[PDB]
């Protein structure tokens, strides 16, 4: 989950890689919108 599994499920790629730092303005908050 740092190669590409941290996404396929995590969609944390088109997100944790570009939102990863803070851009993307959060895939609709998909870290806030998907948080817990």
TrEMBL record:
Protein name as annotated: Aragonite protein AP7
Cellular component GO terms held in the UniProt record: protein-containing complex
Keyword Zinc annotated: no
GO biological process, one term: shell calcification
GO-annotated molecular function: calcium ion binding; metal ion binding; zinc ion binding
This protein's UniProt keywords: Signal
Disulphide bridges, residue numbers: 15-27
């Amino acid at each position: 989950t740092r190669h590409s599994f941290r996404r396929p499920f995590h969609e944390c790629a088109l997100c944790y890689s570009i939102t990863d730092p803070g851009e993307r303005q959060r895939c609709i908050d998909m870290y806030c919108s998907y948080t817990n």
